[PDB]
């Protein structure tokens with residue numbers, strides 16, 4: 001699967017998940033031109049590639065996206081929290 005829940009309002013999302021897929025699953029409104037995946041989305045939004053083990057976040061609307069797992073410079077897994 002491209003994502004899994006871990007707790008109320010909190011999920012792990014594979015970097016390869018399409019932004020459009022994420023919006024369909026989660027009822028969100030993310031958009032970014034010339035970028036198709038959630039890995040590309042978060043990397044672009046952060047503006048810098050995190051070190052392995054470094055877990056910066058980007059907030060947008062009621063969502064917080066965290067770089068949960070890097071494999072070299074590839075963003076493998078995002079953590080997503082939803083707020084009210």
Ligand SMILES: [Zn+2]
Nearest residue numbers: 007010080081
């Ligand atoms: Zn949490």
Ligand SMILES: [Zn+2]
Nearest residue numbers: 049050051054
């Ligand atoms: Zn740093």
Ligand SMILES: [Zn+2]
Nearest residue numbers: 050051052053
């Ligand atoms: Zn390192």
Ligand SMILES: [Zn+2]
Nearest residue numbers: 052070071072
């Ligand atoms: Zn390494």
